[PDB]
Design a protein around this ligand. Structure first.
Ligand code: CA
Ligand code: CA
Lengths: 151, 685, 95, 41, 152, 51, 51
């Protein structure tokens, strides 16, 4: 976690690389790239971080794992494991656990993101910028006068 | 770059409505049993419940539901386990499903309180979902559930030991909790479970988000002479950052970020999400609903009543009169209805509109139009969460009939700070960024916002760079309603803070050339803050309509102009001081992020140099010596734009914002007119 | 057909802005440093200011937020290695 | 610029729900009459 | 302007209940269990429980209703059905109607059968109705500018 | 629709069968792809076009 | 793969209901690896199929 950023789990390095390779923003402090440079298939138009908390399973002393079959809420007003006519009787509900109020539970936090509908890029530049249709390193002599194997 | 641990207290509810058994009617109680005075005297016990499950037979062991065919004792029976069987929610299959012989159910005990099914929870206590409390005997936990056999009441008529059983109810005990709902009609002061307590009702508590402010305002001390930052040359032992109590940094950064970019999109790094409000909550476009059709429920099985009938084949008459008879082909007792089937009825749309109109406006009316409750204890501190939660507001105030067919906003609701709400989309987004729980370890990045070094290009060397941060809990945070936060106890602890920086892999000699070139005297750095204004705040005692301000003699070289607005004292901390104890409101400061609503509360202003020479000068304005902002209805000839305002004030504002006005008005171009402008935020009603 | 007799009310909303009055002689903006700001009358002599406000009454204590607009500029110089010096100017209402 | 005839099979259904007695309660049957065996015969 | 009918999303019945929650009721009486010595089982009546208790059995009284569908119909009706061409309507029964085919009274007191347009008209097809094309679509209360100007 | 609950096995009319119910089938549309992608061969040595 | 198999496999409503992951803007873990475009809400596919 010492390196993650944007309230998510993505290392600073990958964020810098993506921002430079897409819009050459990242050496002057980040900010929202302008409209026309950010089209549908872009990066910043397809980046969403998310996070939640759930009930810990080793500190809430009265944790009791409950299967699906024995879970009842809104009983006596909904079906049982299907969309059919209502069944059962009223009763206090057993388990959506509480997470707020005077009676919270010990909880842990999870974080992830969603970046569908784009390609991860890496530019073949010396300093990850878009300085010309042909990059500079592609002209570097050592890469244009011999052969090398890639792994 | 900061890492820490935040606790939002007990008063944080992030959703509208409740979660548990929300479909059940708001007055329906659960299965229970209570005590009545005997009628010493042997107090009796009454039971209100029902038994949904259908079984096979009942004996002193219980109710049998299984048949192990290959059992050692022939076909030994299988009785339901008393710890989780029978399931509360298992019922019948078909709408008819004619009645069985016996049945069973679950029922609470007289010990625990009674609460309506709407908003009732009780944590499970075994792997299979059991809710029965546990008790330590011999060092081991054991249950306490105990049958309660039952039987017909016709008992009261003939026959004897023929009394057989016909409905076993299992009965137990829970640790019922009601985390997010409260009582809305409690009939009696006492709490002993009466007969009437079976009709108590509960409703949920207003949603209330708490999160970090926009752009992390308040997190870094600016403009505080007590705790000024520092960025200086290490060996210098001489400062290089200066500050006064009037340079209002945070608002200036707000405006600058408005100018050079759009705002209606959010950036997670700096919490950039300005706080909006729905355009229809503030201003009501009420024109009823479309309900030319009636709606109608129906009988689960289609036809409700009936009336047995008998087939009568037409064994016709002989010769003359037509006689009749009976037939044996059919059955003998048939179900048949007559006429339209029995049906209930509801008006759909108006109900939805009414629900919304109550729930999204009425609860926020000014406190002086609400009345204390009955038989519930309510805090005597008029700021905490409970007080705001438990007062009662008459739904008759706002409903389908109010200001019908007109576009209007209520005069009670004009001065209510409308950014304190729960549809303020920025607040929802920010509160969801951290998560929905109450214990949160977090990890953030805070920008640097002082202009005079905001963009400065540093040059090689060793520098000392140091700064101060706040630990208060209502400054660095923000609610949705406006309740205090020191009372309710939400805490925040900073563990580690580390600093990051980025460089450019510039070529060696090029950088050396640029450095030597930039060290010269004549090409230094110039910087200019966006807002570039002073700041003066003057008190306004309650119920006064006159404010004079005088500035003693002085020179006015290179002035630019006046800007002004109005503010509520309850929503503004004191300047400079590192901690304002008299501050008890955790809503949204306008003075620090630009959210004003009092602008309509003005009449006019007048200016003078040396107390005798007015300055519009030389009779320019239509009025002689005063900017007549708004006139009352008596202004028979000067109201303009179909609204309250006068022409000349309109002209002045339009000039000073858009340089439009000397050649007929019109709608200024988009890119020239931004969020905090004038014309984007003008509404006549 | 049976409408009662009536009167009419009107009012406006100006959420989320500031009220402006700039120091020109024609209420326009023809450049940052305004013309009246450098005229001889207001730059080589003294003057005293009087403002009077008329507002709409309320019930809780309030504040009047007045913004005088001036210039705020800073010049930053750094001759040698690891030594930085600055100077500020805030014209009227100076330090 | 092409022209042809297209058949989307039998598993083509562009609406959610149905169009035949949409309001009627789901459980209810329509008028009918069935047979039973009387064991008393 | 264009009817774009997709049906409505309704896979769950929506039920309504009794204001109290439990259906009918039938008096009942508690019993106990004096042992059945040497024989089956006795079955007496205990005195601790007052001998008239309320209880239902099976499920509970309930009524069905189709929320989404019902709303959609209201809609199509109120917004497309009324504005049909005049000739597709018949006069009401036993109520006066002005003979002048322009004034408000006539424009209102006629009746148009909700059977013409239903929850199944041209279902699944993005399309517009023949009678409606040559009838002005700017004379319609769903208008935005007209509403704004009327309220102003 | 397809029967979402069938209490019996034989479909013969019976007293119980007054309780069967229904549920609408899920919708699925079918059409021509965007830009007719795939309607025209490309990129394959098998069926190269000719100009 | 055919229609009826996708039409008659039934799933419990309880797996998702109005008490799911409350307050938290969040996606179900089972749904981060299911193609979110083979989905009937899709506007473009709908328009093409109507056309
Ligand atoms: Ca009775
Ligand atoms: Ca009875």
């Amino acid at each position: 976690e010492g390196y993650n950023v944007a309230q998510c789990n993505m290392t600073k390095d990958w964020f810098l690389v993506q921002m430079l390779a897409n819009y050459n923003i990242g050496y002057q402090g980040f900010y929202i790239p302008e409209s026309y440079k950010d089209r549908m298939y872009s990066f910043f138009r397809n980046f969403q971080p998310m996070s939640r908390q759930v009930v810990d399973d080793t500190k809430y002393k009265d944790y009791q794992q409950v299967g699906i079959i024995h879970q009842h809420n809104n009983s006596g007003f909904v079906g049982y494991l299907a969309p059919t006519m209502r069944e059962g009787q009223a009763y206090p509900a057993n388990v959506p656990y509480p997470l707020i109020g005077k009676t919270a539970v010990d909880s842990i936090t999870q974080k992830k993101f969603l970046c569908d509908r784009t390609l991860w890029r890496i530019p073949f530049s010396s300093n990850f910028m878009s300085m010309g249709a042909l990059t500079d390193l592609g002209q570097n002599l050592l890469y244009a006068n011999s052969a090398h194997a890639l792994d | 770059d900061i890492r820490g641990v935040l606790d939002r207290g007990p008063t944080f509810k992030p959703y509208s409505g409740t979660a548990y058994n929300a479909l059940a009617p708001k007055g329906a109680p659960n299965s229970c049993e209570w005590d009545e005075d005997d009628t010493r005297n042997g107090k009796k016990t009454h039971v209100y419940a029902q038994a949904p499950f259908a079984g096979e037979a009942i004996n002193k062991n219980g109710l049998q539901i299984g048949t192990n065919g290959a059992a050692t004792e022939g076909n030994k029976e299988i009785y339901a386990d008393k710890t989780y069987q029978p399931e509360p929610q298992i019922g019948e299959s078909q709408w008819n499903e004619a009645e069985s012989s016996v049945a069973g159910g679950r029922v609470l005990k007289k010990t625990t309180p009674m609460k309506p099914c709407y908003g009732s929870y009780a944590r499970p206590t075994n792997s299979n979902g059991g809710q029965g409390v546990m008790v330590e005997q011999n060092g081991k936990l054991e249950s306490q559930v105990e049958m309660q056999f039952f039987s017909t009441s016709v008992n009261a008529m003939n026959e004897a030991n023929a009394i057989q059983p016909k409905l076993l109810l299992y009965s137990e005990d829970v640790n019922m909790e009601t985390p997010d709902t409260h009582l809305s009609y409690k009939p009696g002061k006492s709490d002993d479970n009466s007969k009437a307590m079976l009709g108590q009702q509960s409703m949920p508590n207003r949603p209330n988000y708490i999160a970090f402010r926009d752009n992390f305002i308040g997190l870094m001390y600016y403009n505080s002479t007590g705790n000024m930052g520092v960025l200086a040359g290490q060996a210098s032992q001489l400062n290089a950052v200066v500050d006064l109590q009037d340079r209002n940094t945070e608002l200036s950064y707000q405006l600058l970020l408005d100018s050079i970019g759009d705002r209606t999109r959010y950036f997670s790094m700096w919490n950039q999400a300005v706080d909006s409000y729905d355009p229809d909550v503030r201003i009501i476009e009420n024109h009823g609903t479309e309900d030319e059709l009636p709606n109608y429920c129906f009988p689960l099985g289609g036809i409700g009543v009936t009336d047995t009938y008998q087939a009568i084949k037409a064994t016709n008459g002989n010769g003359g009169a037509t006689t009749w008879a009976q037939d044996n082909t059919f059955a003998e007792r048939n179900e048949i209805g007559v006429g339209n089937n029995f049906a209930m009825e509801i008006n759909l749309n108006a109900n939805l509109w009414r629900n919304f109109l109550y729930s999204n406006i009425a609860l926020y009316l000014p406190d002086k139009l609400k009345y204390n409750p009955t038989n519930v204890e309510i805090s005597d501190n008029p700021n905490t969460y409970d007080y705001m939660n438990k007062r009662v507001v008459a739904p008759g105030l706002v409903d389908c009939y109010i200001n019908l067919g007109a576009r209007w906003s209520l005069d009670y609701m004009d001065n209510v700070n409308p950014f304190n709400h729960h549809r303020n989309a920025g607040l929802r987004y920010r509160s969801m960024l951290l998560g929905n729980g109450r214990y949160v370890p977090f990890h953030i990045q805070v920008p640097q916002k002082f202009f005079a070094i905001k963009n400065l290009l540093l040059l090689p060397g060793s520098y000392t760079y140091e700064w101060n941060f706040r630990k208060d809990v209502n400054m660095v945070l923000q609610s949705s309603l406006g309740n205090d936060l020191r009372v309710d106890g939400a805490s925040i602890k900073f563990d580690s803070i580390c600093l990051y920086a980025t460089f450019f892999p510039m070529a060696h000699n090029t950088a050396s050339t640029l450095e030597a070139m930039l060290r010269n005297d004549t090409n230094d750095q110039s910087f200019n803050d966006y807002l570039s204004a002073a700041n003066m705040l003057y008190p306004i005692p309650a119920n006064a309509t006159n404010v004079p301000i005088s500035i003693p003699s002085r020179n006015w070289a290179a002035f630019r102009g006046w800007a002004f607005t109005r503010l509520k004292t309850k929503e503004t901390p004191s300047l400079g001081s590192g901690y304002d104890p008299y501050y008890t409101y955790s809503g949204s400061i306008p003075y620090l992020d630009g959210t004003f609503y009092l602008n309509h509360t003005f009449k006019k202003v007048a200016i003078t140099f040396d107390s005798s020479v007015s300055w519009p000068g030389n009779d320019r304005l239509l009025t002689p010596n005063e900017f007549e902002i708004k006139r009352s209805v008596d202004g028979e000839g000067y109201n303009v734009a179909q609204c309250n305002m006068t022409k000349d004030w309109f002209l002045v504002q339009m000039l000073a914002n858009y340089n439009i006005g000397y050649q007929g008005f019109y709608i200024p171009e988009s890119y020239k007119d931004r969020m905090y402008s004038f014309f984007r935020n003008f509404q006549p009603m | 057909k049976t409408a009662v007799d009536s009167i009419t009310q009107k009012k406006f909303l100006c959420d989320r802005t500031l009220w402006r009055i700039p120091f020109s002689s024609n209420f326009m903006s023809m450049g940052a440093l305004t013309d009246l700001g450098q005229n001889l009358l207001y730059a080589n002599s003294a003057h005293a200011l009087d403002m009077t406000f008329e507002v709409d009454p309320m019930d809780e204590p309030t504040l009047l937020y007045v913004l005088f607009e001036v210039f705020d500029v800073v010049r930053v110089h750094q001759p040698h290695r690891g030594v930085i010096e600055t100077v500020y100017l805030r014209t009227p209402f100076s330090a | 610029d092409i022209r042809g005839v297209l058949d989307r099979g039998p598993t083509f259904k562009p609406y959610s729900g149905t169009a035949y007695n949409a309001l009627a309660p789901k459980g209810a049957p329509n008028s009918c009459e069935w047979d039973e065996d009387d064991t008393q015969v």
